[model samples]
Target chain A: EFMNAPLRGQVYRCDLAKPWLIVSNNARNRHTADVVAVRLTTTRRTIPTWVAMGPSDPLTGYVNADNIETLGKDELGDYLGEVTPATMNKINTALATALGLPWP
Target chain B: EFMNAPLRGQVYRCDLAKPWLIVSNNARNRHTADVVAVRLTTTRRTIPTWVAMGPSDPLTGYVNADNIETLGKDELGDYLGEVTPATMNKINTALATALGLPWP
Candidate 1:
């Protein structure tokens, strides 16, 4: 399903928000995985609440379904698309800081 | 949400399964809540594993994203959309029977 389309390591741009890190998994959270995101300029142009993504981020954020349109599925087939270990480390570290979960 | 599109006391038909009674909420579960479904004849012909939807039920089952495509909206417009107390009671009873949780 589209809601389940998001993944732990990938990033997706939102319809009402800029982009977010798909942080949680279905195994732990059954409804919809939690996401950390920045504000979007979508649906209009409101500055995101979180840092717009880049190599270095300001602060981490969380996203909810009321804000986005949909998540795409171009990352490999199922999880683990080849994001460089460098960028992956950065995003995951950000995720850990935000939630105190182990880094991916 | 397609995933969260489901509700506590509603029954939904699955693409690869029979009608399912949406069981959990994102607040508690997160990724996709949880599903209790029967088999469908959708996307192909097959025998349903659980009871197809009706006023009465037989057994309850759980479903996952790999078996579903989407969930329909229009139930009272959200989480507490008005499902009749009687049917809601039935669903809740079946749900409690399956999971051993308190009955609604």
Candidate 2:
């Protein structure tokens, strides 16, 4: 059943202190994965904190706080200034690793 | 300001030898994002470790240690299982470019 069924994944909180917004998708059902956890770190002071995802988030939707931290007003502007295409690629790469999938 | 000024967040701390505990909240507040870092690992042979959120030690709290190792409990379970899933994914995919999504 594990082979045919969509991998059942759950979002768990990560230990590091960092703002992480994790997204996910259903491979067989859609073109892109959906967003899952939007974890905001509250760790100690001084350290490059970041949010991460579990196995459920999609490979494409991973965005750091710098990118989506200020959404709505200037979605395009913020996204462009905060996140680069290469960073998106990195997010996907991180997802592939988290899900045990091959990189693109 | 930062329009919708509740978008700021933080959390960090790694390169240590053990467990951590962290938590966060946002937007018009009020919800249960409360969960302890349940990491369960012993970094040093005798020092057992687990997850710990920011500087705050909440209820349901952190779980760790057998020796001097300060670690969390369930938080790092999945991550701990694999050293580098992304790297592994890249290496495997490099050998076979025909790889697809939803890897098992």
Candidate 3:
């Protein structure tokens, strides 16, 4: 499943959004680890409400359960490549604190 | 244009995103001042990347230029609904500050 993707911060594509960033621990599959994520947008409107999704573009965000999925689901996605692992932890922590969760 | 929305924090629909929040000064049509926005999603993966697009559910984010558009362009958008004025100001300030402009 998309949740247990083997690493956090892994980016994928989806129907409503593009370059979907994976935020949950991928040690398991759907229901086992499930998934958590934000859809990225380069609109550059706000900062505190929008995490710095960068290193390259250095800005983006995540999405929800219905909107979340794997590239193989015919949902129009691809593993477009990635940001640095350093960037991954940055995104995850920003995401966790915003969600009121203990960071990983 | 999608930019001249009258009130701030007016949410609309777009092709790449849904419930797209209008964060720019909407007194004029797009290009005259155009629009500034962020796409909202309820993934709840993180806080900073996620703005509570609510008063209802109260959480979401924005998008970029290519991914942004009006409801009639066949991008699949509608005037779904909106957040509050206080929330609007909050989102706008956050949007402006993030975009490297002085908060309006």
Candidate 4:
């Protein structure tokens, strides 16, 4: 099952049992910004993500879903390719090994 | 009737018909904070409020509900007593006067 994963921006991991993210733009104040959570699906292959304007959390890079679309299909495809299972597995395996876990 | 008044922090006064404060702290990212709201009641005489770490809004004070418990009953009593109808009326009257409205 695809678990609710944390993406950049105001995205939340939600509960492990549900593939949902409790997102909202009403964080600081209703007028300050907009908060929303975009559900991810493998079918789409590449989904756009969004974040507020300005410097933010270092780990979660800062482009929001709105601006992400501006990257277009080609760029999105390239971005998705890097996060594909094969690439993710490599990083996961490396980290697991570092933590003394056997990598499949 | 008590209107949904806007206090400082992540509070949205909700609808005017209901006295509620929608507060939260899952703003920037996870592994960083907690979000909550304290329902206010005139009977309690005072309600302790809270906010997250660091500098925040100019109108709202910084403090979380958990830590607010430490203020003790006496402090809370004093605080609540001041927010009574008399004080609020004074502030409202002053504001109205400044706005060029006739004050009763």
Q: Write the per-residue lDDT of candidate 2 for residues B1-104, one digit (tens) a residue.
A: 22221111111222333322221122211222222111223332221123322233222223331111112222222122221333333333321221122233
lDDT of 1 by residue, B31-54 (tens): 433432212223422222122233
Docking quality tier of candidate 4?
incorrect
* Second chain alone, TM-score for each candidate: 0.37, 0.16, 0.56, 0.23
What TM-score does structure 1 among the candidates reach? 0.28
- Between 1 and 2, whose lDDT is larger? 1
Over B1-104, each residue of candidate 4 has an lDDT whose tens digit, in order, gives 22222221223222222222222222211221221232333332122222222232222232222111001111111121113333233333332222122223
Give a tens-digit lDDT track for model 4, residues A1-104: 22222222222322222122212212211321212222333232221222222232222232222111111111121112113333223333332221121223
Interface RMSD of 3: 14.7
Reference-based lDDT, residue B35, model 2: 22
Tens-digit lDDT track for model 3 on B1-104? 44333334556666545566654333322333334345565444332223454445344443221122222223424665657666654554343222222123
Ranking by lDDT: 3, 1, 2, 4
Ranking by TM-score: 3, 1, 2, 4
Ranking by DockQ: 2, 1, 3, 4
Q: Point out where model 3 deviates above 4 Å.
A: A1-6, A29-34, A56-76, A102-104, B1-104
Pick the winner on lDDT between candidates 2 and 4: 2
TM-score of each model, in listed order: 0.28, 0.22, 0.36, 0.16
Top-TM-score candidate index: 3
Model-by-model DockQ, in order:
0.04, 0.04, 0.03, 0.02
Worst 10-residue lDDT window for candidate 2 chain A reads: A69-78
